[PDB]
Amino acid sequence: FAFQAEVNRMMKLIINSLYKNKEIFLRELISNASDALDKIRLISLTDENALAGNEELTVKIKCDKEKNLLHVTDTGVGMTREELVKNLGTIAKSGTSEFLNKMTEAQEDGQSTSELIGQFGVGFYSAFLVADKVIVTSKHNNDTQHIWESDSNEFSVIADPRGNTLGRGTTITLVLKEEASDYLELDTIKNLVKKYSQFINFPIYVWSSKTGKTVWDWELMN
């Protein structure tokens, strides 16, 4: 079924073109990080032990020029394997089959083209506006650490062989597109994070340089 795949991918490449200011993806990822942090914070006000796997409550963003990666890590509630499968799996299933079904369903619901274009700019899915592949590493108090991966067509999830390295929380890793290389520039990231971190009740940091030789460390953005 390679033919339909060329149609599916092309349809996406075009919808993305409608978004000249894709920066919205960073706002949505920060918003999800914030919700996950509020959830574990609320739970901690009832059960102090709930923070046992990792005592801090933060969002840490880092750029990886070499691998062409953008990492967004929060120490929030995290997701179990089933959650990765149900909460992200279905949302990231925009392949030939899924895309067409939702399309004809779009005719049924009578949704407008605007309402279609709009779905590409909100929530977790907005990550694809700038990424070819998205990798999610998560650790929830009720499960072992897992890795989920998707290219917006298929998705797979397996137990992280490195074991529990997060303690608790989630890392969203974005494999950026060539045209999104901008989101690898230290100053662009700092500007956008500072822009969307104003109403989050948790410290958000960006890995940056300071200044002996030059040193790199977490710089507070809000």
Next chain:
Amino acid sequence: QAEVNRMMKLIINSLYKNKEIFLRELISNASDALDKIRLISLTDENALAGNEELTVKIKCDKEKNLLHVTDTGVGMTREELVKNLSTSELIGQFGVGFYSAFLVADKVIVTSKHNNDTQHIWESDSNEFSVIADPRGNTLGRGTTITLVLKEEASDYLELDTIKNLVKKYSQFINFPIYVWSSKGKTVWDWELMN
């Protein structure tokens, strides 16, 4: 179709078969993988650069109830893991092929590294399967590790002497050495040859 497939499956399993032959099938597969790369090395001088040995190593992990069968053969790329790993399970029911692993395993995890790709991890319970790049990086050098999460019934397959005799039984005509991680002489561990 789903009707005949199920009928045959119930039937096939009705006849007796020693589940032990699952190892036979894996060793068989390791031997082939090693043949494929060994031959290639006769034409590509640097073919074995990733791992300078041609072996089959078997390790027991009672703790996690795991059984590991690692070969330094040709390996599989992401694409091959998906393509090379249905009528398959049915064949496995008879006790032949990769799927025979499920005769003693609830889950099968396959870690593989091929010269033309990065290390990937494949996992399945026979119903569904997933595959992703190994976050640990290229740890195998080249080759494949079949990780079996054994069923309660197959708990005995984690006894040194059991696996040793089992491997010793199916290694007589393999063109490559096969080892089993064992102890022996003040409580020391290392690889012990079998064939």
